[model samples]
Target: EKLGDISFSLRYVPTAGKLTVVILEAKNLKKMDVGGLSDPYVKIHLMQNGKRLKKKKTTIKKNTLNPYYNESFSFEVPFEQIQKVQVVVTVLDYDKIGKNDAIGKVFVGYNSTGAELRHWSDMLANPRRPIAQWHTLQVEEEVDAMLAVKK
Candidate 1:
């Protein structure tokens, strides 16, 4: 269940006329492929109104569980609508023959609060200051089991 984890950060800035530049950085990741290492990369989805509005990706890091991807992606969005934007960070194992396997995902925005929301809010409040955190990856089964135990 623990394929590893990812560390990332975000920067938000309100620009000219409701346009905001959101800087997303994939800082580093670990333990993505268990049996063998993988060619890993990050894909970011900016969702609003139950749909993906934009997508971006980082370059692949070949054959490593711990990849340092100090890569940044930009998004243009309106400040007023930013609260409705959901940021989904998906890490995948790069494969040439078969479909890519999604290692894990981190959710931010309307569906998320606490740390995720705090990070987003802090970035918006500070404007250009990066809010960083390391997130552990989880599978559905793991989450369900944990919930059962908690209950």
Candidate 2:
């Protein structure tokens, strides 16, 4: 159920009306190109209803699927609508000579089920403390379905 995925931290700052995310690291990513290793990074977006808001991403790491990326980012999330947004992270294998190939996906937010919901539920109204969790990855098709729904 869990493989080729990542672990990250989440925190909400009510006073500032922002969501902070720290991409801690990744592991067990399947190979991408010729080498057994792969160049990987994450494309992240915050989704709300039918709108896909502005996105963020990490720098590309070369020759390894299990790369350690202690990256931190924050996004605008007005306190009132905090329960309406979803954080979708798509791991990509960036190819120098070719297109960036998507490896897997995961998200945490209001409508997300399982561990994702639990992770999000813990964030609201709590002080600005990082809540860390692991998420199982999904194929590209799965991500497509998730985003298309209720839109």
Candidate 3:
């Protein structure tokens, strides 16, 4: 019910392409003042034209030191769907005493080309970590030649 249990967005930008995703990495969690143990939760909400479209939950991992958490959320924009969009990430501060509340929030939107992302799909399906030998820069002269393009 207070500002301490508040969430805030990081950024919002125009989206490009048809398929897109919003990624988030969050940590450093503390339970709210409640009754029992807390089970921290992360969720994402997608909105368009002031209407809620979807809500997706994220998995939480516990840690005694620094915790690492990440979640990827995606939504498809049909050709007929609204152009503008908004995304919000909700971090539930589970109650250690009473009713749990949101402790953090993150906002984001589609930014640029999803092409590299699609290519990544194939790379992941059959990963190929490029060896250092794949690179051809063998000398400082090669670097100079590369940077000598029309400026």
Separate clash counts for every candidate: 1, 0, 10
Candidate 1 lDDT (Cα, 0 to 1): 0.65
Please write out the lDDT profile of model 2 over residues 11-71, one tens digit for every residue: 9998888899999888988788874678899888988875788799999899897988989
If scored against the real structure, what TM-score would every candidate get? 0.78, 0.91, 0.45
- lDDT tens digits by residue: candidate 1, 77-143: 7778777677777778898778888776766664565676676677777775667776666563443
Q: Pull out the clashing pairs in model 2.
A: none
Say which prediction, candidate 2 or candidate 3, comes out ahead on TM-score: 2
Off by over 4 Å in 3: 1-24, 30-38, 62-66, 79-83, 95-99, 110-151
What ordering of candidates by TM-score runs from best to worst? Answer: 2, 1, 3
TM-score of 2: 0.91
Candidate of highest TM-score: 2
lDDT for each candidate structure: 0.65, 0.84, 0.39
- Where does model 1 exceed 4 Å of error? 17-35, 140-151
> Which residue segments of model 2 deviate by more than 4 Å?
1-3
Error of 2 at 142 (Å): 0.8
